[PDB]
Amino acid sequence: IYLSRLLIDTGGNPDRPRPGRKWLDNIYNVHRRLSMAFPSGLRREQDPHFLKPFSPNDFQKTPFLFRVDNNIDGNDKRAIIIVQSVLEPDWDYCFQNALDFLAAPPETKEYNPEFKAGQLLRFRLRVNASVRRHIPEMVQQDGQTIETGKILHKRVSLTWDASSTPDQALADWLAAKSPKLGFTLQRCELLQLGWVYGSKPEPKNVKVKEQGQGYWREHKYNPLRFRAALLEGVLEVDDPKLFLKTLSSGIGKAKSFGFGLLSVLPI
């Protein structure tokens, strides 16, 4: 598989238009752009310069994993995007009209990861602290109303006991499912605990005009909220046929919006 690197300028003059920095405001925009970085054959031949209208059905729907972190390069702040996929990405076709998005040209390296039993890898990982509660619908109404009755099962953020710590709680949450994916954690240090926001358009059929031919479509924007937890540590390995499938896929839900990427450095 391949790992790709994108560098975005975070500092610079703050009184100028910075479309590369503004692109990281919406994570759906990031996912859509990385999807546009995967042309589907005849799209390149029909549109080499990427000027015809964008169509999701004209691009491949292969999954990929990416992580957006931040760093300092000498005396400048930078945002690094690490893209892990299974097919060779084409960053030339994606940003060819948006060369000002990236401060530095993209990079790509072939990854051939395999580790037999006895490797103490150093890992970094940003998970989505999500859980499906059995009773997540109390219907806490607002205003004058405070308590009405309905029940449904929904995904919400992970919660911890008031007498415990978030670090230990997330450590045992990761260790509880850990033998299924094939690793043992020695140290688990919590580095961040926050949210990830985004917006998504959805077509809506307002009334048909004179021969509207399938209603009049109007965009309506719906929000997207995720609870993110970034953590590093040291982990061993066992059953490498399971760890390779763990590396190929992600960990936790919402894998298509920056979560689940496991970064491992051999030691």
Is 167 a binding residue for other proteins by CB under 8 A? The answer is yes
Contact 48, 96 (CB under 8 A): no
Contact criterion met (CB below 8 Å) for 243 and 237: yes
Contacts 24+ apart (CB under 8 A), 50-56: 50/93, 50/94, 50/96, 50/97
Task: Find the shortest distance in angstroms from Cβ 225 to RNA.
Answer: 4
Nearer to RNA, 185 or 193 (CB): 193
**24, 131, 185, 190: which one contacts other proteins (CB under 8 A)?**
190
Cβ closest to RNA, residue 106 vs residue 252: 252
- Measuring CA to CA, which residue among 251, 259, 121, 266 is closest to residue 192? 259
Summarize as ranges the residues that interact with RNA (CB under 7 A).
28, 61, 63, 128-140, 153-157, 159-166, 177, 180, 193-195, 197, 200, 222-227, 249-250, 252-257
Owner of token pair 């309905």: 150
Whole-number Å distance between alpha carbons of 237 and 246:
11
Decide whether 80 or 181 has the Cβ nearer to other proteins: 80
Helix, strand, coil percentages (3-state) for the chain, rounded to 5, are: 20, 35, 45
Residues near other proteins (CB under 8 A) are: 3, 5, 11, 13-17, 19, 23, 25-26, 29, 32-33, 36, 49-56, 69, 71-73, 80, 82, 97-98, 100, 107, 109-113, 120, 122, 124, 140, 142, 165-167, 189-190, 193, 195, 197, 201, 203, 217-219, 223, 225, 263-267
